[PDB]
């Protein structure tokens, strides 16, 4: 055993001396020799040599392509690595002990510094052995997740970030394994594809906080792995596309959003897809009829880049979709309607340019515009026949005709005749009969349901007509006449001609359900005509008086339905942005006289702002907006900028159901959250459109909201607008995330929040909780909050008193926000959560530090953190906390405090073959924490169906858990006192025990 | 249609499922499987598991499974719901041929359930739910549908053989033997190639078990193993990581296969085995000299086994004279 | 033997509950005699056995006897208090044994102390849970026991 | 032959639709995505005539001359040699490897002061 150890070790010396091309011959002989001798040292040496060899090559490769000092060229380096990996893999196929050593050597929570691009590529090729397939792939999955947890933990702390020099991450490591796999590493791809699918299956979004972000990163890595492997390796792409389509083409209604983005990215290389894997798309197209409507629309939008460039795929899609049209089975014509709508709103040119002995002939015929127009018109005629189907099918067509009419201008006439004819079925052309529309004809009774979305039909007509009269001009003269007729007759309607103040309006009776459904249609019609009368005749008084009367018709029926007991607004986002701008910040004498009609109605102000809030909320929930151009991120972003400017101006210009200014502040909070969530790269352009860098513009907005909060605080307690103050802090919290922490602007935000917390003593607990959470979020990214935590504990101790009931605790009054009512359970629960974060950071250092063996600077910082956190706990362990969750959380946190102390002692137990600071920390814990923990336990216990048994058996855990933690700590202090020959138990008193004795 | 009205007609559809003909079984089931919602999946599939008996007759059964394979091809929930029905069952009597056939179909068709099928299979075998007779009956009468997925079955058999429980190991060995017996020539070569990998793996448990399977295959079907001798001969190149006890067994199966028949194919292997040992007996390496003695004594046992002409008697005698001299 | 005594249910015969309670009292007396023998035999192998198996006896007590005490505390009150009071004398000697192990810093002995201390305190909290289930929370009251030697000499 | 056309006819409606289906990815990368192809790299040895370096194939001998000069006006003082032959300052490494080198190993260049 010793003799074979020397011969291999001497050969590892030859690794750095012998030529690179000579290594693989040496490895094979030394690997097979390892069968009868040492096994771990053989694999560890090969892995260590190439890990440093690759690292040295990476360092020297970076730089200009001008003359460089390169030892090993990348071409031969990947060749020797690739053939040596195959040598190791072949050895495992005959040994099974070398493979177990490799997994055990590369076992991961710990950073696992032995992981490298060479070792990861070695592990991936090992997965070709079915025995080690699941075992190795589980190792790689755990490594990336832990690596992302480490990355998230470092970025969220400044204390932790200073002490840890940066290290590479497994996610970065695997990506360059894919990059290096181009050099004939075909033995890696199969395990590389399997790992990418495991990462995306195990950590895909299951929507159907702390751990959600690292899970999203692991899923993204799988998509990056699968996408990059698709481009490089031609023989694995057909398996990637087939597996991707398997998770997407289902009726299981499982969350597949991540899979659809990967499929959309793969088909961006359409010629790359058509060359090898094109049948998989065609078989997927065959199942489109059986898929649900939601799946078909999302699947077709994913393979849209493929359809844009390829004629055969469009021909295959049309061929399949045409069958679904003629298919008698329902729920499949719905997918055909979606297929034609998506295909007709995106492509101006459609159409092409068999039996056993039937072949296709390449006819060289020029493209005919007339033939294409006839082809497109025939499809629209097939869509017109679908306006007699279920209300769901009509809804898609109304939403889709506007996009179709904007893409294909030749079909504009077909749309209007199709739309006008449908309106005639419900429009009363008699110039004096009321109501203007036959609301009973839109209802299907068989159970009373809705047959025709008449309000959505009018919305499509109004938008399509508006586009018509401004685009194709440089039926239409009759469409304005009808809409004008509907406008006037709806206003003079007495709200009884609809058979609607309260007849039944119930949710169970048939007539009640019909009235509720009919109530939505008339309100939706009012919204559409409000949009219509705004643009026509420009800013004329008479039309605006008709909007207010139309709104009152909508508002009155909205009130009656709300009080007895919703739906989206039919206004487009562009109109809401345009309406708000004129309604608040338009100053032109011609416009002023007409706009005074709309500005005088306060309820119209509520409606206009609230609809804008609805539009923003749809963006956050869904990612797109309901109205026209509601799935175009560029136009949504432009509308957010204009809406923000109006809401920002209104809130700042005039201070204060809810008032208009409060509504504008509420909308501002949603927009800031929505902009950062979706339009992350447009933040500089978003802040630019409000009237340097992101930090300078953000600070200007931040200081604007800072002054507003100062005015609320400066007022009296009864006048303190709690709702606005919390909403202001939410705005400041979101904006402060944009500042760079290493900047004078960030320091001012931290310095302003600290001053507010130290001087204001509001009685509202929700405001205090939000303000302190802002202070701690800012502070943690600046420095360790242990000093801040220690000062807050002294305030909680001062207000709530001491458990001794015979000594007086002096009131520090470090922060005025920590008053007698907010001290518990608001500040106490808040600081305990922050101290729990501090312990999780320190315990991460010790784990990283212990597994490592700069041991000197990290040890001092850890001891300094635990030394300060001891004083924080020393204050709370002798506070008369209420019997609720404050005691339970402190007991659980004290257990975490002692667990971390034990982990530190066990570290020095491993290293001591004891500095003065560690001496003082052990002495400090035994003089200020341990004796007072026993006093707290006595304090807590003395003062005071099947679920009752559960509650009492749950209450019996926390105190024994702490006693175990203290005794476990003193056990390892005895072990350290023996190894280090210094008695650490002289600092510790004797353990105090309790005896129950019933009265 | 009305969900309640659709439920009632589907219940009547499955009510008389036993009394219907054979050719309509695909289309009637084709209706039911698509007539499944998210919540109703578990309850419907459990009924269909028991309401189905299955006891152009050979073709229509294949058509039935072809419909099911297409029906669950894009449906993971239905495939997963089938296994839950089998997992919940705790009585051996309920398990039938149709039960085992479906469990293999889900394995081959959908790869997202490889692990879940494996874990449940271990429990059923270990608890005695799945028996040799159920496996024997499954292959015997429904090898037409199983033959399509011989690669999938052998991957399942190979994984079962890596276990540490004799019940699982015995079943995995049986899965190898039944695949060799009922499938075609190409999948038989896969069976032998899979066994050779186990013998060269290094595990004492796998090498011992795989050698027993090879001996059973030789005794059962010497003619089929006769043309697979090239791969079996390849194990002789990896005698370094094989114990002397297993070397004796490896020579026994090689010797009993070479002398099973008197055809011209055997005579090529017989003289091939003589020369392999002849060049091991004379090897300067001492370990291979001992391997030659073990192999030559083993061959002489089959050579002189009593059930022998003079020319055979002098041939085995000459082999012993060679071993004595070396 | 103690692990095999089930608490049964509250709907069993009163004599059955009385018999089990009498059975538990004998087990505690036998435990008391065995534990008290560490005063004369105070070698490490004896203390290791007493320290290791004292924890297991207490764990079985609060898992098997405590549910029985929940069922029968109103009808049987003097017996339950007598059983708990006598068992309290035994647990005090377990505490002194834990202190004795830590004072002499015997690594082989102190490696059982943390788990026995948790179960010793878990018993104390379990008694209070019993009183709450019988609406006697105000009857519960703790006190700090004096640290004693193995012989019984106070450590101060 | 997948598709044949004249150069000027690519703009037509029929040809453009046909080009989208026939043009392969390796032509799309350069003509549409405007990506830049790889730069081939030729490593070589600098040794004193009596430290491996990797450079672009297009690198001139002058660049290698000045690198040695900084290691130890550059044109006048330093003459580079290969196979005991003088190297033209304007000649590139790619040409040197092909004509003068006449060997199957990494190109070796020898530097000596003029």
From Swiss-Prot, chain A:
Molecular function via GO: DNA binding; DNA polymerase binding
Modified residues (Phosphoserine): 506
Compartments in which it is found: Nucleus; Cytoplasm
UniProt cross-link Glycyl lysine isopeptide (Lys-Gly) (interchain with G-Cter in ubiquitin), position: 323
Keywords per UniProt: Cell cycle, Cytoplasm, Disease variant, DNA damage, DNA repair, DNA-binding, Fanconi anemia, Isopeptide bond, Nucleus, Phosphoprotein, Ubl conjugation
Biological-process GO terms, alphabetical: interstrand cross-link repair; positive regulation of protein ubiquitination
Phosphothreonine carried by residues: 695
Domain of life of the native organism: Eukaryota
Effect of residue 994 to Q: In FANCI; abolishes function in DNA repair
Post-translational modification note: Monoubiquitinated by FANCL on Lys-323 during S phase and upon genotoxic stress. Deubiquitinated by USP1 as cells enter G2/M, or once DNA repair is completed. Monoubiquitination requires the FANCA-FANCB-FANCC-FANCE-FANCF-FANCG-FANCM complex. Ubiquitination is required for binding to chromatin, DNA repair, and normal cell cycle progression. Monoubiquitination is stimulated by DNA-binding. Phosphorylated in response to DNA damage by ATM and/or ATR. Phosphorylation of FANCI promotes ubiquitination of FANCD2, which prevents DNA release from the FANCI-FANCD2 complex.
Primary location recorded for the protein, binned into one broad class: nucleus
Disorder: Fanconi anemia complementation group I: A disorder affecting all bone marrow elements and resulting in anemia, leukopenia and thrombopenia. It is associated with cardiac, renal and limb malformations, dermal pigmentary changes, and a predisposition to the development of malignancies. At the cellular level it is associated with hypersensitivity to DNA-damaging agents, chromosomal instability (increased chromosome breakage) and defective DNA repair.
Family per record: Belongs to the Fanconi anemia group I protein family.
Record's comment describing the protein's domains: The C-terminal 30 residues are probably required for function in DNA repair.
Protein name: Fanconi anemia group I protein
Whole-protein coverage range: 188 to 1290 of 1328
UniProtKB/Swiss-Prot annotation, chain C:
Compartment(s) where it occurs, according to its Swiss-Prot or TrEMBL record: Nucleus
Post-translation changes: Deubiquitinated by USP1 as cells enter G2/M, or once DNA repair is completed. Monoubiquitination requires the joint intervention of the FANC core complex, including FANCA, FANCB, FANCC, FANCE, FANCF, FANCG, and FANCM, and proteins involved in cell cycle checkpoints and DNA repair, including RPA1, ATR, CHEK1 and BRCA1, and is mediated by FANCL/PHF9. Monoubiquitination prevents DNA release from the FANCI-FANCD2 complex.
Tissue distribution: Highly expressed in germinal center cells of the spleen, tonsil, and reactive lymph nodes, and in the proliferating basal layer of squamous epithelium of tonsil, esophagus, oropharynx, larynx and cervix. Expressed in cytotrophoblastic cells of the placenta and exocrine cells of the pancreas (at protein level). Highly expressed in testis, where expression is restricted to maturing spermatocytes.
Residues recorded with modification Phosphoserine: 13
Family listed: Belongs to the Fanconi anemia protein FANCD2 family.
Domain notes: The C-terminal 24 residues of isoform 2 are required for its function.
Disease named in the record: Fanconi anemia complementation group D2: A disorder affecting all bone marrow elements and resulting in anemia, leukopenia and thrombopenia. It is associated with cardiac, renal and limb malformations, dermal pigmentary changes, and a predisposition to the development of malignancies. At the cellular level it is associated with hypersensitivity to DNA-damaging agents, chromosomal instability (increased chromosome breakage) and defective DNA repair.
Protein name: Fanconi anemia group D2 protein
Organism: Homo sapiens (Human)
Gene behind this protein: FANCD2
Residues of the full protein shown: 1245 to 1400 of 1451
UniProtKB/Swiss-Prot annotation, chain D:
Source domain of life: Eukaryota
Tissues with expression: Ubiquitous.
Subcellular location: Nucleus; Cytoplasm; Lysosome; Late endosome
Similarity comment: family membership: Belongs to the WD repeat WDR48 family.
Function: Regulator of deubiquitinating complexes, which acts as a strong activator of USP1, USP12 and USP46. Enhances the USP1-mediated deubiquitination of FANCD2; USP1 being almost inactive by itself. Activates deubiquitination by increasing the catalytic turnover without increasing the affinity of deubiquitinating enzymes for the substrate. Also activates deubiquitinating activity of complexes containing USP12. In complex with USP12, acts as a potential tumor suppressor by positively regulating PHLPP1 stability. (Microbial infection) In case of infection by Herpesvirus saimiri, may play a role in vesicular transport or membrane fusion events necessary for transport to lysosomes. Induces lysosomal vesicle formation via interaction with Herpesvirus saimiri tyrosine kinase-interacting protein (TIP). Subsequently, TIP recruits tyrosine-protein kinase LCK, resulting in down-regulation of T-cell antigen receptor TCR. May play a role in generation of enlarged endosomal vesicles via interaction with TIP.
Additional observations: Knockdown of WDR48 increases Akt activation.
Protein name: WD repeat-containing protein 48
Organism: Homo sapiens (Human)
Gene (UniProt): WDR48
């Amino acid at each position: 055993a010793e003799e074979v150890e020397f011969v291999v070790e001497k050969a590892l010396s030859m690794f750095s001396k012998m030529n690179l091309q000579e290594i693989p011959p040496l490895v094979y002989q030394l690997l097979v020799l390892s069968s009868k001798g040492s096994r771990k040292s053989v694999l560890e040496g090969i892995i260590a040599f190439f890990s440093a060899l690759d690292k040295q090559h990476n360092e020297e490769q970076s730089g200009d392509e001008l003359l460089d000092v390169v030892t090993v060229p990348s071409g031969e380096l990947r060749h020797v690595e690739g053939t040596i990996i195959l040598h190791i893999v072949f050895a495992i196929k005959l040994d099974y002990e070398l493979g177990r050593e490799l997994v055990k050597h590369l076992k991961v929570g710990d950073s696992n510094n032995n992981l490298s691009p060479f070792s990861i590529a070695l592990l991936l090729s090992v997965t070709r052995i079915q025995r080690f397939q699941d075992q190795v792939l589980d190792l790689l999955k755990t490594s990336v997740v832990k690596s992302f947890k480490d990355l998230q933990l470092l970025q969220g702390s400044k204390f932790l970030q200073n002490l840890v020099p940066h290290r590479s991450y497994v996610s970065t490591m695997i990506l360059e394994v894919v990059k290096n796999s181009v050099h004939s590493w075909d033995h890696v791809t199969q395990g590389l594809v399997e790992l990418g699918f495991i990462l995306m299956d195990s950590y895909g979004p299951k929507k159907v906080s702390l751990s959600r972000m690292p899970n999203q990163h692991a899923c993204k890595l799988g998509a990056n792995i699968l996408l990059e492997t698709f481009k490089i390796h031609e023989m694995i792409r057909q398996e990637i596309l087939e597996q991707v389509l398997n998770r997407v083409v289902t009726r299981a209604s499982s969350p597949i959003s991540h899979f659809l983005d990967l499929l959309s990215n793969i088909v961006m290389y359409a010629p790359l897809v058509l060359q090898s894997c094109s049948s998989k798309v065609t078989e997927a197209f065959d199942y489109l009829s059986f898929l649900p409507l939601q799946t078909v629309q999302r699947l077709l939008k994913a393979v849209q880049p493929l359809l844009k460039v390829s004629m055969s795929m469009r021909d295959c899609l049309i061929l399949v979709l045409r069958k679904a049209m003629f298919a008698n089975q329902l729920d499949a014509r719905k997918s055909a309607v979606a297929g034609f709508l998506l295909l007709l709103k995106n492509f101006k040119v459609l159409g092409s340019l068999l039996s056993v002995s039937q072949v296709h002939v390449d006819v060289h015929s020029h493209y005919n515009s007339v033939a294409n127009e006839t082809f497109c018109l025939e499809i629209m005629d097939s869509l017109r026949r679908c306006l007699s189907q279920q209300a769901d099918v009509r809804l898609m067509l109304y939403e889709g005709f506007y996009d179709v009419l904007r893409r294909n201008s030749q079909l504009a006439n077909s749309v209007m005749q199709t739309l006008l004819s449908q309106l005639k079925q419900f429009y009363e052309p008699k110039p004096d009969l009321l109501p203007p529309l036959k609301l009973e004809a839109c209802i299907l009774t068989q159970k009373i349901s809705l047959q025709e979305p008449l309000d959505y039909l009018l919305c499509c007509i109004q938008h399509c007509l508006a586009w018509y009269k401004n685009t194709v001009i440089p039926f239409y003269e009759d469409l304005d006449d009808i809409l004008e007729s509907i406008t006037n007759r709806m206003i003079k309607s007495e709200l009884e001609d609809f058979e609607l103040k309260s007849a039944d309006f119930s949710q169970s009776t048939s007539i009640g359900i019909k009235n509720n459904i009919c109530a939505f249609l008339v309100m939706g019609v009012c919204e559409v005509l409000i949009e219509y009368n705004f643009s026509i005749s420009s800013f004329s008084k008479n039309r605006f008086e008709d909007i207010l009367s139309l709104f009152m018709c909508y508002k009155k029926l909205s009130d009656i339905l709300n009080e007895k007991a919703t739906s989206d607004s039919l206004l487009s986002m562009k109109f809401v942005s345009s309406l708000l701008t004129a309604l608040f910040r338009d100053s032109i004498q011609s416009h002023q006289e007409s706009l005074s009609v709309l500005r005088s109605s306060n309820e119209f102000m509520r409606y206009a702002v609230n609809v804008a809030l609805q539009k923003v909320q749809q963006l956050k929930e869904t990612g797109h907006v309901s109205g026209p151009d509601g799935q175009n991120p560029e136009k949504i972003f432009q509308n957010l900028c204009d809406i923000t400017r109006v809401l920002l101006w209104r809130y700042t210009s005039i201070p204060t159901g809810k008032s208009i200014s409060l509504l504008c502040l509420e909308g501002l909070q949603k927009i800031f959250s929505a902009v950062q969530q979706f339009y992350q790269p447009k933040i500089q352009q978003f802040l630019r459109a409000l009237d340097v860098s992101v930090t300078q513009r953000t600070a200007f907005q931040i200081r604007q909201f800072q002054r507003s909060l100062l005015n609320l605080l400066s007022s009296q307690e009864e006048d303190f607008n709690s709702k606005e103050a919390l909403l202001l802090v939410t705005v400041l919290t979101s904006l402060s995330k944009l500042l760079e922490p290493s900047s004078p602007q960030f320091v001012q935000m931290l310095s302003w929040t600290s001053k507010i917390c130290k001087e204001n003593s509001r009685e509202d607990a929700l405001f205090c909780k939000s303000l302190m959470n802002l202070l701690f979020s800012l502070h943690v990214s600046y420095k360790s909050p242990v000093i801040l935590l220690r000062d807050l504990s002294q305030d909680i101790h001062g207000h709530l008193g001491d458990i001794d009931q015979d000594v007086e605790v002096e009131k520090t009054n470090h922060f005025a926000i920590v008053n007698l009512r907010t001290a518990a359970p608001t500040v106490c629960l808040l600081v305990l959560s922050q101290a729990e974060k501090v312990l999780e950071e320190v315990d991460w250092l010790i784990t990283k530090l212990k597994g490592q063996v700069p041991n000197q600077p990290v040890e001092k910082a850890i001891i300094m953190q635990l030394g300060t956190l001891l004083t924080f706990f020393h204050e709370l362990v002798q506070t008369a906390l209420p019997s609720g969750s404050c005691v339970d959380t402190l007991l659980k946190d004290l257990c975490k405090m002692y667990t971390t102390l034990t982990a530190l002692v066990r570290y020095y137990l491993q290293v001591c073959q004891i500095p003065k600071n560690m001496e003082k920390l052990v002495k400090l814990s035994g003089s200020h924490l341990t004796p007072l923990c026993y006093s707290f336990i006595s304090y807590v216990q003395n003062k005071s169906v099947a679920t009752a048994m559960a509650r009492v058996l749950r209450e019996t855990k926390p105190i024994p858990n702490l006693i175990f933690a203290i005794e476990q700590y003193e056990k390892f202090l005895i072990h350290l006192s023996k190894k280090s020959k210094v008695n650490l138990m002289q600092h510790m008193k004797l353990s105090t025990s309790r005896d129950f004795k019933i009265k | 249609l009305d969900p309640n009205f659709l439920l009632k007609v589907r219940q009547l559809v499955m009510d008389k499922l036993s009394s219907i003909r054979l050719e309509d079984l695909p289309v009637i089931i084709k209706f039911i499987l698509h007539s499944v919602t998210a919540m109703d999946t578990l309850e419907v599939i459990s009924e269909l598991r028991e309401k189905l008996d299955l006891q152009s007759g050979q073709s229509c059964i294949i058509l039935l499974f072809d419909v099911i394979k297409s029906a669950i091809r894009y449906e993971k929930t239905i495939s997963e719901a089938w296994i839950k029905a089998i997992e919940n069952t705790a009585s051996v009597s309920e398990h039938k041929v149709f039960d085992l056939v479906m469990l293999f179909i889900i394995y081959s068709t959908n790869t997202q359930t490889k692990k879940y099928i494996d874990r449940v299979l271990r429990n059923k075998i270990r608890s005695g739910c799945i028996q040799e007779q159920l496996l024997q009956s499954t292959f015997s009468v429904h090898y037409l549908v199983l033959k399509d997925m011989c690669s999938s079955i052998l991957s399942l058999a190979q994984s079962l053989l890596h276990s540490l429980d004799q019940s699982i190991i015995s079943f995995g060995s049986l899965l190898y033997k039944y695949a060799f017996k009922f499938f075609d020539t190409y999948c038989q070569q896969e069976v032998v190639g899979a066994l050779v990998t186990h013998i060269c793996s290094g595990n004492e448990a796998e090498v011992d078990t795989a050698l027993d399977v090879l001996l059973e295959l030789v005794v059962l079907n010497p003619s089929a193993m006769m043309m697979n001798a090239v791969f079996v001969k390849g194990i002789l190149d990896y005698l370094d990581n094989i114990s002397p006890q297993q070397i004796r067994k490896l020579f026994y199966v090689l010797s009993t296969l070479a002398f099973s028949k008197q055809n011209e194919a055997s005579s090529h292997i017989q003289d091939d085995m003589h020369l392999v040992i002849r060049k091991q007996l004379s090897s300067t390496v001492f370990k291979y000299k001992l391997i030659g003695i073990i192999g030559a004594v083993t061959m002489a046992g089959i050579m002189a086994a009593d059930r022998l002409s003079d020319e055979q008697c002098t041939q085995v005698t000459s082999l012993l004279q060679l071993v004595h001299s070396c | 033997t103690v692990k095999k005594i089930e608490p049964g249910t509250a709907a069993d015969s009163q004599q059955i509950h009385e018999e089990k309670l009498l059975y538990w009292n004998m087990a505690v007396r036998d435990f008391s005699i065995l534990i008290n023998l560490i005063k004369v035999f105070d070698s490490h192998p004896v203390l290791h056995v007493c320290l290791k198996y004292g924890r297991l006896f207490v764990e079985a007590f609060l898992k098997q006897c405590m549910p029985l005490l929940d069922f029968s505390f109103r009808k049987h009150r003097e017996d339950v208090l007598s059983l708990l009071e006598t068992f309290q004398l035994d647990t005090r000697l377990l505490h002194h044994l834990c202190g004795h192990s830590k004072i002499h810093q015997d690594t082989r002995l102190t490696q059982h102390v943390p788990l026995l201390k948790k179960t010793l305190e878990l018993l104390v909290c379990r008694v209070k849970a019993m009183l709450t289930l019988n609406n006697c929370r105000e009857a519960f009251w703790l006190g700090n026991l004096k640290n004693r030697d193995l012989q019984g000499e106070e450590i101060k | 032959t997948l598709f044949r056309l004249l150069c000027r006819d690519s703009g037509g409606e029929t040809e453009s639709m046909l080009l989208n289906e026939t043009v392969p990815q390796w032509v799309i990368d350069i003509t549409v995505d405007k990506n830049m192809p790889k730069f081939n790299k030729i490593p070589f040895y600098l040794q004193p005539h009596a430290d491996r370096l990797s450079a672009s194939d297009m690198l001139q001998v002058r660049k290698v001359m000045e690198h040695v000069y900084e290691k130890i006006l550059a044109e006048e003082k330093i003459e580079l040699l290969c196979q005991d032959q003088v190297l033209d300052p304007n000649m590139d490494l790619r040409t040197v490897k092909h004509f003068i080198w006449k060997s199957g190993g990494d190109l070796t260049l020898h530097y000596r002061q003029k």
